[PDB]
Amino acid sequence: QSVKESEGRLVTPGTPLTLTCTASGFTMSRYHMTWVRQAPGKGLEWIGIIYARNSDTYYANWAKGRFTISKTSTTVDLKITSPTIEDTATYFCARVDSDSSGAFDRLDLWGQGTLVTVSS
Amino acid sequence: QSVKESEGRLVTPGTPLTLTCTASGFTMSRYHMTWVRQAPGKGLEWIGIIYARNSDTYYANWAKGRFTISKTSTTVDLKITSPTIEDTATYFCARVDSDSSGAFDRLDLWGQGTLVTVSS
Amino acid sequence: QSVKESEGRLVTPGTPLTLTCTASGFTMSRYHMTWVRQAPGKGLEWIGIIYARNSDTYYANWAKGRFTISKTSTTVDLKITSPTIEDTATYFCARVDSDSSGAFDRLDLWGQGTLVTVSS
Amino acid sequence: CVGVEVGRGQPLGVGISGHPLLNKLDDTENASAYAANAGVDNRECISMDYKQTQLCLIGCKPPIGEHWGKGSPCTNVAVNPGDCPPLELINTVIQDGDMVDTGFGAMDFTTLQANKSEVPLDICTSICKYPDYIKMVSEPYGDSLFFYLRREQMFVRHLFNRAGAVGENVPDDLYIKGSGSTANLASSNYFPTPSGSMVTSDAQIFNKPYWLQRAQGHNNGICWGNQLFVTVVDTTRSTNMSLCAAISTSETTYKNTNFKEYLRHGEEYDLQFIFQLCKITLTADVMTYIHSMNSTILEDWNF
Amino acid sequence: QTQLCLIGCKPPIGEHWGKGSPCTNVAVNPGDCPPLELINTVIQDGDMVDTGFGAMDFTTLQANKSEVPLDICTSICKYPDYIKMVSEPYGDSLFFYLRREQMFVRHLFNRAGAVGENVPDDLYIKGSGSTANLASSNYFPTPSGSMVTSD
Amino acid sequence: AQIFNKPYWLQRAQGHNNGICWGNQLFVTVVDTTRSTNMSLCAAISTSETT
Amino acid sequence: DPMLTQTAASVEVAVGGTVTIKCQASQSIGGYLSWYQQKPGQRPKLLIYRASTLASGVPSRFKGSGSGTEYTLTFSGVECADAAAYYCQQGYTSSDINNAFGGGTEVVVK
Amino acid sequence: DPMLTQTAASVEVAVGGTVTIKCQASQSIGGYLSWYQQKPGQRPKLLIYRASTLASGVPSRFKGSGSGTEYTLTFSGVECADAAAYYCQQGYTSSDINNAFGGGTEVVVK
């Protein structure tokens, strides 16, 4: 049920960055996982998706070459290769509750979300 | 048969806390596990439950958002996220001996139990 | 999709050397991997190949006794045993997109490539 | 006509077919754990065999078949895009090159299935029609068929369920509402993979002469207008010969990219009849009757 | 499982598929599909009955040498055409014959070779990711005889 | 391949007794296993639950 | 690319009013659509999916309708804890899109 | 050993010209052949494989032909970002060969 994250860091631009995401009750090889990014003002921006047994991925149009989503049977995580200044925002990990056919982007049980920021 | 625990710690409020639980003879992928908490005065309070094959969890009503139970084939454990002052008490790990249908909350073979306390 | 490498090193002749290669989206037990080396001037030189479930290898004619390609389900890598002076060049890791019969040497999705050099 | 025969000479051999991306999801005979969720495009590669069927029909007119097919939905209801199309029986004339049914139902898959992914290849864009024995024997002349024979058999081999959206929901009074890992239900629809049994050689309906003395129509086997049709369906002699060809003949080690692969099929027939001469005397008592049968019969004679 | 018996004054005549001489409209490539032609011949002692794989040559038509088992890998499975033998003007090729045979599928497999003719892409919908590449479009069954009996 | 639901008129029994009931009794035995499906019922203690 | 715009800043509403938030889509998405409430201090929280089926632990005083390309979300009897942020979101899981499913706000209720 | 030589330095071409790069092979390789563009600052990048089928995200103004032992690669309408390095490459995956699939260059277009 509950979705857990890794604690945030104040980093420098040009350094790789990770956030792991572990779950409490369900197993992750059954359901799907996705990441969203909450920027100040409005900002609420979806990153990508990863599926359960097919283990395929689909990113955003602007997000190719910029994020790599890794998944084991115990933990899912996402990666950042080259940070740009304006990604100081809030990230979230959530479970895709779907049905026998959809895999549609309902994120039913969210994560608590931590703060990641970059500074130079 | 015998149920083993990790040794207790005197901690500060605001720090995550773990207790592993290992078994001697039986394998844990067959049976179920749960956790109870023995407070002074009366106190004897049950935390949650886990099942051997489905691996589903069910917590108490007041205990949601406050405990996450992890299980591998070798070791079960439970976790605490944000401790409050009044959880200085005694915890126990025990095996649910059940039948082909019940999974009822008989805890037949208990653990020896260690002392965990928080202080500020 | 994206293909990742390990960061380069300035080494001395007579020391073993490794480069790991991890992938982003696809799994590596399905497809094949190989390695090419980009020298200055023209230079563009292919090293070897490794297959998916057969897990066989075939090297170049001059490259026997000089490279050993290792592969797990999570990471592929290649190894150097005894470096000679003139291998200061650029290495690349790429996925063999093939069909039900070919395993022909199309390298569709390349890696970004890092700089490795030796000096005495 | 008096007696016919339909000869074959290829050996009795089974066929095979199947799709590279066939719309399966999971397996449903025994689930040790609950079914995993389905992403996008979870189809796989399955093959099967078709049901064994034989057939022979002889008539002075072409034989009339049937199949299901889409019609026009009622005007009053709002046509939502993605709703269930109408279903209506359709009577056509069979032709050489039309597929027979395969135990998957007799329906035009083109208009009724937009997936193109639920049947194997050779019936994926064509229709499959079962012959109408009811309408043909109720033709009150009997010109569609003189006599007919058929044998068929099938049995279930595997039991799948299809990936795809629930087009009609399951009611919440049939089942007790689940919880936990099974709060969301699995796919309700299934489909079986058919298979024919062993083919043998007592149950052949070919290479035998068939003398006819009567027929259930009034037309006692008379080829009106000098014409005759014969229908033959046979899936028992259906071997699929697999061949190859080599690129180079000089290399000394087996490499996969040196041989291309093709499939070819052979089928052959021959027909032998007997006809008996028949005269008709002509009177205006008779001529009105043949004028009501067919227009072109009396016109081709210059009488 | 197959049994037969033939009695005749001339030797019996067989049939099998075989490669002929193609038209030279297109130049033959290394790896083009060869043409087919029905060939008649005389049966000799040592040739093989058809075993559920088609009466075809397995030297010229199958250069891979690894698609059938060993017994027919070089020999040619022939099948006796009753059509040409009954239609002889004198009937000396045979004058008495009996046959029974049976077969059914046991397993289903793929051919691990180059796809010579791809499927036209209006017959499916292109996928992505793992299924962006098509699997092999060639299957073949493994036949198996049924129960042998004494009746 | 059934046996029952059809009468059996006997013309001559195999033994010396051609169907005579001494003592005014006769014994009929039968063993059937083609009709041995066991029905499987179940009964709830409380239907009030949601899950 | 299916796009839901939501260029609509919410109007001041009193206790017991009714609000019609309208989320329009360019391409047809079917019924696959979600809605969320975002309180500005914590994690987001979902109300309804597939435009008709509400989630657990949520009162039945929220409504769901709309089919095809345009959809809505109405409710009545606004409490004190309804000061949050709202978002409509599709589920067409395509590849070449850059959705972010954005738009939507809610004033502090008087 | 199948060898593709490519002993051909490219000729100066203007905007809109047509270039015929010819890659000849000693042994017959079938249709299994690839082509690549190498910009001199980054990773190499494919255009066409099996001499007829182009890859994704590449305009259809590049051409592919050739069968047997010799093959070609033509295009027209040369842009400004076509200053790169070209390479033909076979796929006969043999053991005793030392291919490197070398040869090929492109001038800076005027």
Side-chain angles (χ1 to χ4, degrees):
Chain A
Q1 293 177 335
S2 95
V3 187
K4 259 284 286 200
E5 279 93 322
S6 178
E7 220 61 83
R9 261 172 304 273
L10 320 105
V11 296
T12 166
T15 298
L17 180 98
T18 50
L19 295 174
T20 59
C21 170
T22 79
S24 68
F26 64 97
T27 211
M28 292 177 72
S29 64
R30 287 253 315 248
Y31 308 92
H32 314 322
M33 288 295 184
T34 183
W35 293 89
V36 288
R37 166 178 63 168
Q38 189 212 6
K42 160 219 201 177
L44 197 79
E45 275 191 325
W46 158 70
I47 309 230
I49 61 171
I50 184 166
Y51 294 113
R53 61 172 183 171
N54 197 296
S55 146
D56 234 315
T57 29
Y58 296 97
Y59 298 113
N61 209 359
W62 51 265
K64 321 191 215 196
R66 220 191 262 190
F67 309 89
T68 59
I69 308 234
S70 178
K71 168 212 89 192
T72 59
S73 88
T74 326
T75 304
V76 72
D77 55 306
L78 87 161
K79 271 218 211 178
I80 261 136
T81 59
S82 48
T84 211
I85 283 121
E86 35 220 357
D87 329 319
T88 170
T90 323
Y91 291 90
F92 295 93
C93 179
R95 175 187 54 101
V96 187
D97 188 36
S98 64
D99 56 346
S100 47
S101 77
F104 81 110
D105 295 351
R106 162 165 70 112
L107 275 66
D108 188 331
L109 295 174
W110 290 74
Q112 56 152 354
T114 59
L115 277 322
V116 175
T117 168
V118 67
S119 161
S120 65
Chain B
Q1 294 300 320
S2 95
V3 188
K4 259 284 286 200
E5 280 93 322
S6 178
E7 220 61 84
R9 261 172 304 273
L10 319 105
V11 175
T12 166
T15 298
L17 180 98
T18 50
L19 295 174
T20 136
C21 170
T22 79
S24 68
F26 64 97
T27 211
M28 292 177 72
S29 295
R30 287 253 315 248
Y31 308 92
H32 314 322
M33 288 295 184
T34 189
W35 293 89
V36 288
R37 166 178 63 168
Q38 188 212 6
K42 160 219 201 177
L44 197 79
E45 275 191 325
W46 158 70
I47 310 230
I49 326 322
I50 187 200
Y51 294 133
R53 35 149 120 220
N54 20 336
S55 147
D56 321 331
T57 29
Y58 296 97
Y59 298 113
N61 209 358
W62 51 265
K64 320 191 215 196
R66 220 191 262 190
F67 308 89
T68 131
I69 308 234
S70 295
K71 168 212 89 192
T72 59
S73 88
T74 326
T75 304
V76 72
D77 55 306
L78 87 161
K79 271 218 211 178
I80 294 169
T81 59
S82 48
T84 211
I85 283 121
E86 35 220 357
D87 329 319
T88 170
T90 323
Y91 291 90
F92 295 93
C93 179
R95 175 187 54 101
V96 187
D97 188 36
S98 64
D99 55 346
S100 47
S101 77
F104 81 110
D105 295 351
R106 162 166 70 112
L107 275 66
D108 188 331
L109 295 174
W110 290 74
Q112 56 152 354
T114 59
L115 277 322
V116 175
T117 168
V118 67
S119 161
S120 65
Chain C
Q1 293 177 335
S2 96
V3 187
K4 259 284 286 200
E5 280 93 322
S6 178
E7 220 61 84
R9 261 172 304 273
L10 320 105
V11 175
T12 166
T15 298
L17 180 98
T18 50
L19 295 174
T20 136
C21 170
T22 79
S24 68
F26 65 97
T27 211
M28 10 180 45
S29 64
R30 287 253 314 248
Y31 308 92
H32 314 322
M33 288 295 184
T34 59
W35 293 89
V36 288
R37 166 178 63 168
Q38 188 212 6
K42 160 219 201 177
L44 197 79
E45 275 191 325
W46 158 70
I47 309 230
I49 61 171
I50 184 166
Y51 294 113
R53 61 172 183 171
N54 197 296
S55 146
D56 181 65
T57 29
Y58 295 97
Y59 298 113
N61 209 358
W62 51 265
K64 320 191 215 196
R66 220 191 262 190
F67 308 90
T68 131
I69 308 234
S70 223
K71 168 212 89 192
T72 59
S73 88
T74 326
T75 304
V76 72
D77 55 306
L78 87 161
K79 271 218 211 178
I80 294 169
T81 59
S82 48
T84 211
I85 283 121
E86 35 220 358
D87 329 319
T88 170
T90 323
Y91 291 90
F92 295 93
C93 179
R95 175 187 54 101
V96 187
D97 188 36
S98 64
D99 56 346
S100 47
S101 77
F104 81 110
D105 295 351
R106 162 166 70 112
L107 355 134
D108 188 331
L109 275 66
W110 290 74
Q112 56 152 354
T114 59
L115 277 322
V116 175
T117 168
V118 67
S119 161
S120 65
Chain D
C1 77
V2 181
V4 309
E5 75 171 332
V6 177
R8 324 285 312 273
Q10 278 317 294
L12 294 101
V14 72
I16 197 181
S17 90
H19 213 270
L21 321 169
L22 186 69
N23 184 28
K24 86 172 290 284
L25 177 63
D26 269 30
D27 194 274
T28 58
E29 58 88 18
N30 205 337
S32 65
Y34 202 76
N37 271 26
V40 175
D41 182 76
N42 284 132
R43 38 200 195 183
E44 290 189 72
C45 167
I46 316 174
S47 303
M48 57 198 63
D49 47 338
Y50 293 141
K51 71 165 204 176
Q52 167 186 328
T53 317
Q54 300 183 339
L55 202 50
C56 174
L57 278 76
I58 289 176
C60 202
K61 301 295 199 172
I64 315 176
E66 50 92 6
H67 61 90
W68 292 111
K70 191 185 143 99
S72 64
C74 295
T75 66
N76 268 19
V77 348
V79 193
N80 221 29
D83 218 347
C84 55
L87 274 82
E88 170 44 30
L89 191 46
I90 285 301
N91 278 330
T92 49
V93 163
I94 79 184
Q95 286 171 256
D96 174 73
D98 290 322
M99 292 276 153
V100 80
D101 71 294
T102 54
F104 273 139
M107 48 178 194
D108 163 82
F109 299 105
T110 309
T111 47
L112 278 75
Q113 286 188 22
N115 202 353
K116 303 180 188 163
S117 315
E118 302 267 45
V119 301
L121 271 301
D122 47 352
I123 59 177
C124 202
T125 58
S126 276
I127 57 185
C128 48
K129 58 179 76 174
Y130 196 60
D132 198 311
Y133 300 118
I134 299 298
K135 193 188 168 61
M136 279 201 276
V137 307
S138 313
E139 286 277 84
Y141 277 153
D143 275 3
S144 277
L145 58 94
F146 304 142
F147 81 110
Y148 73 107
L149 281 85
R150 49 161 210 270
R151 312 275 143 86
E152 61 184 359
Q153 42 181 3
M154 64 172 297
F155 83 109
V156 187
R157 186 179 268 250
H158 282 98
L159 300 89
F160 295 125
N161 62 331
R162 282 157 174 205
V166 281
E168 279 149 343
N169 208 33
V170 181
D172 46 348
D173 74 310
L174 272 302
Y175 70 102
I176 296 303
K177 185 69 175 302
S179 53
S181 312
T182 79
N184 268 0
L185 275 80
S187 65
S188 88
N189 50 331
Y190 323 107
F191 78 111
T193 44
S195 177
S197 279
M198 57 155 182
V199 55
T200 172
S201 187
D202 59 5
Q204 293 291 92
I205 65 170
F206 297 116
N207 305 303
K208 310 187 60 180
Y210 291 113
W211 329 106
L212 60 88
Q213 287 106 343
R214 284 185 69 87
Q216 75 268 41
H218 288 83
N219 197 294
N220 207 331
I222 296 175
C223 297
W224 285 118
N226 295 316
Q227 214 184 348
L228 195 52
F229 294 93
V230 163
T231 316
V232 170
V233 186
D234 192 359
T235 177
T236 56
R237 304 179 158 98
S238 85
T239 54
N240 274 26
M241 320 165 44
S242 177
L243 53 92
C244 65
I247 293 185
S248 65
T249 174
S250 296
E251 76 284 349
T252 80
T253 305
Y254 184 43
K255 289 177 193 321
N256 272 330
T257 77
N258 206 55
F259 308 101
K260 299 219 163 309
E261 305 278 37
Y262 314 95
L263 303 185
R264 290 300 146 89
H265 189 282
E267 210 165 281
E268 61 93 24
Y269 304 89
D270 75 307
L271 308 175
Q272 288 163 57
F273 314 101
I274 292 176
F275 302 114
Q276 174 190 2
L277 182 55
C278 289
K279 69 158 78 155
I280 297 105
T281 196
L282 270 301
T283 308
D285 215 330
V286 183
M287 188 180 291
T288 65
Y289 184 41
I290 311 173
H291 199 300
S292 315
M293 279 192 179
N294 297 291
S295 298
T296 178
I297 292 185
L298 206 64
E299 188 263 345
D300 272 332
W301 308 330
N302 293 326
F303 208 53
Chain E
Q1 161 174 8
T2 312
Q3 297 167 302
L4 61 88
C5 191
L6 295 175
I7 302 151
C9 183
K10 314 287 179 180
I13 315 189
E15 69 180 358
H16 74 115
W17 289 111
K19 171 191 64 174
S21 67
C23 301
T24 172
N25 212 331
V26 62
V28 295
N29 303 353
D32 270 354
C33 197
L36 268 76
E37 176 198 352
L38 201 69
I39 317 186
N40 283 324
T41 177
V42 195
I43 316 156
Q44 316 155 337
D45 179 82
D47 300 305
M48 322 288 288
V49 61
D50 172 80
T51 78
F53 278 116
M56 50 180 291
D57 174 272
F58 282 126
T59 66
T60 46
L61 270 79
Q62 280 200 9
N64 198 15
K65 292 195 175 178
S66 168
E67 281 136 1
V68 301
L70 269 70
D71 318 327
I72 54 180
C73 183
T74 315
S75 286
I76 301 108
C77 319
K78 309 206 278 180
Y79 186 80
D81 42 336
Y82 309 108
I83 304 302
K84 198 169 158 64
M85 287 211 263
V86 71
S87 159
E88 282 314 302
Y90 293 102
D92 289 21
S93 303
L94 60 89
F95 50 92
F96 187 69
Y97 73 107
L98 289 171
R99 53 185 215 278
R100 316 277 165 89
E101 66 271 65
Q102 47 208 23
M103 196 194 59
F104 86 114
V105 191
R106 199 193 274 252
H107 284 81
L108 283 81
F109 287 139
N110 288 89
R111 292 279 190 228
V115 280
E117 308 170 357
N118 300 97
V119 60
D121 77 311
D122 56 330
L123 307 189
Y124 66 95
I125 299 180
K126 304 176 293 304
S128 177
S130 315
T131 62
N133 310 131
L134 273 75
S136 162
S137 159
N138 276 6
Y139 322 99
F140 69 104
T142 47
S144 67
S146 51
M147 184 175 317
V148 291
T149 42
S150 186
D151 51 16
Chain F
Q2 280 282 98
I3 283 301
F4 313 116
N5 294 323
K6 43 167 82 70
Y8 289 121
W9 319 110
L10 74 160
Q11 295 297 110
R12 165 146 50 85
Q14 43 85 45
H16 279 283
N17 193 288
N18 198 13
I20 297 298
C21 276
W22 308 113
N24 309 290
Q25 73 196 107
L26 66 94
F27 278 33
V28 175
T29 180
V30 54
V31 165
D32 209 325
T33 185
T34 56
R35 288 181 173 90
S36 89
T37 81
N38 312 138
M39 65 192 67
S40 44
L41 56 91
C42 78
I45 59 174
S46 288
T47 176
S48 316
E49 287 280 80
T50 318
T51 81
Chain G
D1 46 26
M3 284 182 66
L4 62 80
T5 80
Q6 194 73 21
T7 59
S10 83
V11 175
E12 174 49 292
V13 175
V15 177
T18 309
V19 296
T20 59
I21 277 171
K22 249 168 145 180
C23 168
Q24 206 175 101
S26 64
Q27 291 302 359
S28 70
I29 30 178
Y32 299 94
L33 189 83
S34 275
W35 294 84
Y36 302 90
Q37 64 180 20
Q38 171 76 306
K39 260 178 199 281
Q42 25 170 12
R43 56 175 156 278
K45 179 182 171 163
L46 188 147
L47 281 95
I48 185 164
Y49 61 101
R50 284 157 151 172
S52 287
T53 93
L54 295 174
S56 45
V58 176
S60 60
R61 78 176 149 182
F62 304 99
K63 281 337 170 178
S65 64
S67 329
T69 59
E70 69 252 60
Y71 311 92
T72 179
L73 182 127
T74 73
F75 50 94
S76 43
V78 175
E79 262 204 65
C80 170
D82 314 4
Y86 286 171
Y87 292 99
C88 74
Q89 174 247 296
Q90 48 91 13
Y92 214 75
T93 59
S94 291
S95 335
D96 64 298
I97 81 156
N98 53 356
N99 193 22
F101 43 91
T105 177
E106 183 65 13
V107 315
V108 159
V109 139
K110 171 64 196 300
Chain H
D1 46 26
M3 284 182 67
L4 62 80
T5 80
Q6 194 73 21
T7 59
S10 83
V11 175
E12 174 49 292
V13 175
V15 177
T18 309
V19 5
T20 299
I21 277 171
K22 249 168 145 180
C23 168
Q24 206 175 101
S26 64
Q27 291 302 359
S28 70
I29 30 178
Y32 299 94
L33 189 83
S34 275
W35 295 84
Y36 301 90
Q37 186 173 355
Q38 171 76 306
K39 261 178 199 281
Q42 25 170 12
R43 56 175 156 278
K45 179 183 171 163
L46 177 63
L47 281 95
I48 185 164
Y49 61 101
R50 284 157 151 172
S52 287
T53 93
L54 62 80
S56 45
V58 176
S60 60
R61 78 176 149 182
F62 304 99
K63 281 337 170 178
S65 64
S67 329
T69 59
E70 69 252 60
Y71 311 92
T72 179
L73 182 127
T74 73
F75 50 94
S76 43
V78 296
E79 262 204 65
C80 170
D82 314 4
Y86 286 171
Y87 292 99
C88 74
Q89 174 247 296
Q90 48 91 13
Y92 214 75
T93 59
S94 291
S95 335
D96 64 298
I97 81 156
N98 53 356
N99 193 22
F101 43 91
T105 177
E106 183 65 13
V107 315
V108 159
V109 139
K110 171 64 196 300

